[PDB]
Amino acid sequence: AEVTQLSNGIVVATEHNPSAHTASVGVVFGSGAANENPYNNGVSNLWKNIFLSKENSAVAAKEGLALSSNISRDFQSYIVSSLPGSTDKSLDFLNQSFIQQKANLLSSSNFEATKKSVLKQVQDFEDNDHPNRVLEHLHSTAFQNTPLSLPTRGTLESLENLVVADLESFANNHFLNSNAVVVGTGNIKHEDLVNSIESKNLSLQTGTKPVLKKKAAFLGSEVRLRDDTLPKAWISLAVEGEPVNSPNYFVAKLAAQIFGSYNAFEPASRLQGIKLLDNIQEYQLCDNFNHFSLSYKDSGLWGFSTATRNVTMIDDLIHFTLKQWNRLTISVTDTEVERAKSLLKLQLGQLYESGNPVNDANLLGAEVLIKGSKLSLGEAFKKIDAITVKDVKAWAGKRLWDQDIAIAGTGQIEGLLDYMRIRSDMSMMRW
Amino acid sequence: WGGFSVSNPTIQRFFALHYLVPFIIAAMVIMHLMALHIHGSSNPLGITGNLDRIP
Ligand code: HEM
């Protein structure tokens, strides 16, 4: 009714839904693709993909289980999904996979069939998924020589250099209990799981903490992947944003909300009450964009992302947009702010209140790791609404106005201008 | 000369023509800059600029 949180060594967390047809259990390791290193990159995405190799996934397929997995930057998750009654059928199959079995998934016929498929995997991504590719490199340059930089799915380089002796090197350090959280989502009780958990003995590497690295940092920089053979142009730009559990966590998400997200095709999109939109549409400066305030444990990235078949006029594209961003400091309409608060809520909803347990897991697992607990929607909303204009005019005033940016891109970006232009559009001339 | 020698009708036309002409240079500097414009500047490498332009 307010989400449960109790620890007997294994911090056991759950979240009940009485109208759910199914449920899900799993673990979340409080160390992700940003706890790795330059040459072991993709180790966390390698771990995910053995966990779903036909072997272990045929086991749980007779049982009636489905497994879910994802790696982030600050965190890393291993979830299993099934019918709510077969709730022990989950917990046991989890127990087998992470304390019982070890080299049953770590075969020299398994691992050389997973790594020979996480290699094709990260060779369609950087090959044909430019919007994320661009998005990923954006981190690489903004957070260069620092934790967040390492692409979550790992470089094809440090991904052909890795054997099983390396899957473990990360496992036995960062796959602990004092870095994990067990989650219960969907259609199960707190007294169903934490019972079935204290039912099982053993302890893996107790007392052990996972290790640390130099805290992340940010620096104004570019990286440009020109490719004049690609029909469009993809660009992503940002400033040093705000972390998870930062005073302006919501203030910053409200700002993103204002300019928001465009799709020049859906007539619905064309009518949004966004000021910037007035400009961009005249000549069709782009095909779409969208904003964001990506928050991570140590640092953040407020900016936006755009694709465009309009090559001669990208220079305006970036211009109109970064000028709008100036208003946030000097001239944002209050009535804009309300449409923000309003729309944030709708978005922040379909995020948190989707009828899909697997999401409510990672969400829970990550948050109850970093701050300890989760924060309720009513808590969030109570904050969103407190937000004045002055909220947004002092946040932009430090974060946005005349601060270093972080551009990245690919496709026909000859037209995308230089760094002393772009960066300079962070401000406006004053008397 | 306007007469027997470089005399008075001379320095007076030399003043007037001194006024006129600099506007002719400026007129001409404009076509000069127009030519410059349609090809853009060269480089201390005598190769093509079109791969690494800045504004
Ligand atoms: C009123 C006198 C002049 C003005 C205002 C002028 C102006 C300019 C300017 C602004 C440029 C671009 C910057 C540069 O490339 O230096 C340029 C380049 C050039 N000028 Fe002139 N100029 C003058 C005299 C001349 C003369 C006397 C010549 C030849 C007899 C000449 C031939 C050229 C050429 C061929 C270029 C291209 C240089 C390159 O490729 O970098 N200009 N001029």
From Swiss-Prot, chain A:
Entry keyword annotation includes Transit peptide: yes
Keywords, sorted A to Z: Electron transport, Membrane, Mitochondrion, Mitochondrion inner membrane, Respiratory chain, Transit peptide, Transport
Entry's Gene Ontology BP terms: aerobic respiration; cellular respiration; mitochondrial electron transport, ubiquinol to cytochrome c; protein processing involved in protein targeting to mitochondrion; proton transmembrane transport
InterPro entries hit by this protein: Metalloenz_LuxS/M16 (IPR011249), MPP/UQCRC_Complex (IPR050361), Pept_M16_N (IPR011765), Peptidase_M16_C (IPR007863)
The keyword Heme appears for this protein: no
Cysteine pairings via disulfide bonds: none
Membrane topology note: Peripheral membrane protein
GO cellular component, one term: mitochondrial inner membrane
UniProt-annotated location(s): Mitochondrion inner membrane
Gene Ontology MF terms: metal ion binding; metalloendopeptidase activity
Alphabetized Pfam families for the sequence: Peptidase_M16, Peptidase_M16_C
Biological role stated in the UniProt entry: Component of the ubiquinol-cytochrome c oxidoreductase, a multisubunit transmembrane complex that is part of the mitochondrial electron transport chain which drives oxidative phosphorylation.
Entries under PANTHER family matching the protein: CYTOCHROME B-C1 COMPLEX SUBUNIT 1, MITOCHONDRIAL, METALLOPROTEASE
Family: Belongs to the peptidase M16 family. UQCRC1/QCR1 subfamily.
Subunit structure: Component of the ubiquinol-cytochrome c oxidoreductase (cytochrome b-c1 complex, complex III, CIII), a multisubunit enzyme composed of 10 subunits. The complex is composed of 3 respiratory subunits cytochrome b (COB), cytochrome c1 (CYT1) and Rieske protein (RIP1), 2 core protein subunits COR1 and QCR2, and 5 low-molecular weight protein subunits QCR6, QCR7, QCR8, QCR9 and QCR10.
Miscellaneous note of the record: Present with 19300 molecules/cell in log phase SD medium.
Name by which UniProt lists this protein: Cytochrome b-c1 complex subunit 1, mitochondrial
UniProtKB/Swiss-Prot annotation, chain B:
Residues of the full protein shown: 166 to 220 of 385
Residues that hold heme b b562 according to the record: 18
Protein name per UniProt: Cytochrome b
Residues given in the record as a ubiquinone binding sites: 37
Location relative to the cell: Mitochondrion inner membrane
Note in the entry: Heme 1 (or BL or b562) is low-potential and absorbs at about 562 nm, and heme 2 (or BH or b566) is high-potential and absorbs at about 566 nm.
Assembly notes: Component of the ubiquinol-cytochrome c oxidoreductase (cytochrome b-c1 complex, complex III, CIII), a multisubunit enzyme composed of 10 subunits. The complex is composed of 3 respiratory subunits cytochrome b (COB), cytochrome c1 (CYT1) and Rieske protein (RIP1), 2 core protein subunits COR1 and QCR2, and 5 low-molecular weight protein subunits QCR6, QCR7, QCR8, QCR9 and QCR10.
Function: Component of the ubiquinol-cytochrome c oxidoreductase, a multisubunit transmembrane complex that is part of the mitochondrial electron transport chain which drives oxidative phosphorylation.
Binding-site positions, heme b b566: 32
Regions that span the bilayer: 8-39
Mitochondrial matrix side: 40-55
Family assignment from sequence similarity: Belongs to the cytochrome b family.
